[PDB]
Swiss-Prot record, chains A, B:
It catalyses: a monosubstituted aliphatic (S)-hydroxynitrile = an aldehyde + hydrogen cyanide; a disubstituted aliphatic (S)-hydroxynitrile = a ketone + hydrogen cyanide; an aromatic (S)-hydroxynitrile = an aromatic aldehyde + hydrogen cyanide; 2-hydroxy-2-methylpropanenitrile = acetone + hydrogen cyanide. This is (S)-hydroxynitrile lyase. Homodimer or homotetramer. It is an enzyme of class 4 (lyase). The N-terminus is blocked. Acetone binds at residues 10, 79. Inhibited by hexafluoracetone and rhodanide (thiocyanate). Also inhibited by trichloroacetaldehyde via a covalent link on Ser-79. Susceptible to several serine, histidine and cysteine inhibitors: is strongly inhibited by diisopropyl fluorophosphate, diethyl pyrocarbonate, HgCl(2) and parachloromercuribenzoate (PCMB), to a lesser extent by iodoacetamide (IAAM) and iodoacetic acid (IAA), but barely by AgNO(3) and PbNO(3). Its EC number is 4.1.2.47. The lineage of its organism: Eukaryota, Viridiplantae, Streptophyta, Embryophyta, Tracheophyta. The keyword Lyase applies. GO terms for molecular function: aliphatic (S)-hydroxynitrile lyase activity; aromatic (S)-hydroxynitrile lyase activity; methyl indole-3-acetate esterase activity; methyl jasmonate esterase activity; methyl salicylate esterase activity. The active site is at 79 (proton donor/acceptor), 234 (proton donor/acceptor).
Length: 256, 256
């Protein structure tokens, strides 16, 4: 079967992270959309204009709003993109055939939206040469970050080639996790986000979303299906592109 | 010898086009700077804010201004980047050890700045599915363009892999050649631009800067040195990265 995949990058990244996976999925016959979220990739906004994870998610929500009735997509979110998935599923659940988490945060419906982010920082407290700043938007102080180049090399892009690491140095931008805004946000809903099918894809060789964290997430909120990819790194769409495409084909054949 | 190379992308592109060449040059021991020009790559400006090729060139001029006295760079410009080189050399000639043209426009000092652009459009009049628009800045009508995806596939990225073509689809932006603004600009100077050493690199397999055009440019304004790269495509920094690095090493060993 063929599906329409919507690929959702993480904070400080853009659609460009999907540049290997998108053509491979198209070569299987799928339709692929790879979005830039707000203030990401070649989006014209700067992060200081963005006040929440919901606002950050606007391009995904706008896309989903534009789907004609009856068209369903498979969302694929990497790293912090699982939060964009949860936000989207609470507006457009009827348009989502399934959601695939790719070394991603896995929010739940029992705890507040920041819960898994809070846990991630416990497990991975030291972001190396990452820099931080503050800005104010809609009366709240937001912590922005710029991912450190050593962090990128060693922990995110560990096994990626030098030309892929170079893209990350060139293209990663200032962003935010909006952690304190998530902490005050209404909970993700059981009827919306809770009802979607959730497929969790990971590698135990991830040097930032470490095994303790990922296995904690799987026990916290049981996925419908778990795929463990052997080897690779946090950026499986770069280091294990073929394996990711194979998994996504199986998801397209399972959930519609 | 080692050099400091400053890599200058073409219109509608960004530093990302250099993502393969930059690490290869660093692996030879060089220092490399790959800039986003105004309204290009992850630069925060939109093209409608930009009124001339000189304004478009601001990041390059600002960079050069920041070099301490005595530091000299080798400029490397692809495609329309030769115009940025000429503009830079008329402000900062003493900071330029040499300029390398990489399937690039080669402006002169005898004719007005638009001359080689005018010629290019004669030789290559049909930009396929490229779209155009107008905007007004500083009382002039400017023609903007967005490079067509068929043009990108067939004429710019002819022999590039699908993951490189994908980056171009994701990352190319609206831009402008500022052709009518160039046509009214003061001529490039003999003392400045005319005095720099100029190395012209090309392939006769380029499907946009066709051989008639490139050989016309070489006869119009004789380079100090010409290198012809066999095979490849317009994006030699993607299809012949190793060969380009080899040439640049020789330039570093020749001109300081």
């Amino acid at each position: 079967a063929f599906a329409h995949f919507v690929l959702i990058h993480t904070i400080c990244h853009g659609a460009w992270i999907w540049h290997k996976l998108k053509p491979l999925l198209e070569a299987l016959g799928h339709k692929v959309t790879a979005l830039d979220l707000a203030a990401s990739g070649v989006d014209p906004r700067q992060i200081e204009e963005i006040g929440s994870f919901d606002e950050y998610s606007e391009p995904l929500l706008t896309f989903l709003e534009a789907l004609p009735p009856g068209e369903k997509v498979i969302l694929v979110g990497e790293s912090c993109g699982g939060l964009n998935i949860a936000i989207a599923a609470d507006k457009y659940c009827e348009k989502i055939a399934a959601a695939v988490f790719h070394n991603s945060v896995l929010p739940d419906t029992e705890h507040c939206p920041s819960y898994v982010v809070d846990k991630l920082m416990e497990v991975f407290p030291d972001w190396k040469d990452t820099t931080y700043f503050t800005y104010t938007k809609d009366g709240k102080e937001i912590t922005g970050l710029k991912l450190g180049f050593t962090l990128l090399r060693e922990n995110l892009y560990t096994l990626c080639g030098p030309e892929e690491y170079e893209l990350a140095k060139m293209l990663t931008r200032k962003g935010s996790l909006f952690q304190n805004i998530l902490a005050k946000r209404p909970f993700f809903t059981k009827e919306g986000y809770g009802s979607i099918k959730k497929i969790y894809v990971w590698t135990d060789q991830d040097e930032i979303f470490l095994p303790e964290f990922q296995l904690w997430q799987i026990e916290n909120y049981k996925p419908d299906k778990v795929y463990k990819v052997e080897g690779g790194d946090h950026k499986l769409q770069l280091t294990k592109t073929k394996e990711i495409a194979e998994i996504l084909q199986e998801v397209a054949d399972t959930y519609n």
